[PDB]
Amino acid sequence: TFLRWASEPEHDHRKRMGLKMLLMMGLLLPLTYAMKRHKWSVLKSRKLAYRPPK
């Protein structure tokens, strides 16, 4: 355990950063996905129709 600590004194600090990163990404990924799906809904609902004058 000590040698491990030696080889990575920041082990603890990092894991705290990783926990904050997982919480922030769990907050931010569905919200950015919702913004993308808002701004892409317009097209994803676009209905095309071909009306040759005939």
Added chain:
Amino acid sequence: SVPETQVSILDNGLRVASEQSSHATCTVGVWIDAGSRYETEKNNGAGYFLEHLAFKGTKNRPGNALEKEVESIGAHLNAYSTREHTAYLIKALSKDLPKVVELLADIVQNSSLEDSQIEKERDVILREMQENDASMQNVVFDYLHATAFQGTPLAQAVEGPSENVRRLSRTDLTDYLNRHYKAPRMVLAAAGGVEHQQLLDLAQKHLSSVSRVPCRFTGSEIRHRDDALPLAHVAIAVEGPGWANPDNVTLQVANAIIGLCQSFQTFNISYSDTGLLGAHFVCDAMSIDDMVFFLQGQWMRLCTSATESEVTRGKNILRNALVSHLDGTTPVCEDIGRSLLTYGRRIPLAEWESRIQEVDAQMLRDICSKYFYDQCPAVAGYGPIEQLPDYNRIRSGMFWLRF
């Protein structure tokens, strides 16, 4: 000093309104609260096709002998139909006032729809529609109405789809006629050299028989791309307030401020508690986006940076306008018929002047922010409209990041 419009009411509910004046010729019309908004998609061209059939003869005056009568006094006979109102009006001399009223009585009741004529007027209507597509701005405004009022009776056109036109019969027409031609929904309007008591007596004599019995705007876009056309027509609108909401006047002043594309016209179309407020421009393909950008900037300037000088200019343009119009007899009668159908009364020009002079810059930018800022518009394009921006760019141009 403008003479007041005097309104009376018969038992039938037909309000007989008149506004006498020196001019010796008069415009006597009948205004009916019946349009394409009252049609239920099975009779989508009934008002238009009845408007075609209404001058082709009645029971008392069979066929062209009827129009021979309106040739005999040299009078002019006109009719039009909108999405909410139908009008049958005659311009004539003053001394021919009785017979004209009698003629109008036949046109609203006792009318005769000949089956022979029905086929002939179907070919007329069908053909006109088959060529109506030629008029672009009409195509663009119909597209704007359709995409702005999707799923409602306000999307469907006055003419209707060719389908219904072909599939229509006397009985259907008879229904529309017998259903939407009620006496309480009718105004007999007269303007010019007419006496109100004589017109009231004539309405009591004839026309005393007329029988007595959720609008939604959807921010959307329709793009009809056809690259062979030389010019592109684009209309952008937001939801209007309606007939009875007074800030219309303020919005009219805003339109008078706006007044880059070859043709730029602003419109405030009003229906019963709804409407379309916006701009239509007709342009070359390679300019379209710049126009749009220009136009949106002006709207946001009216939402944010309206000054007193442009407000004064818009008030002067509005005053002159309403007063320039309402000049000839017809224009006036037309105003009497629409005022009795929509407001229920004739608003005098002094009240219009009071509502114009109470408008200042602060309430203009307040009302413009209420109706233009951060609103979803309806867009209708026809022609080479590839460089016309899609809905995100227009929607983002409907607001400013600096306010």
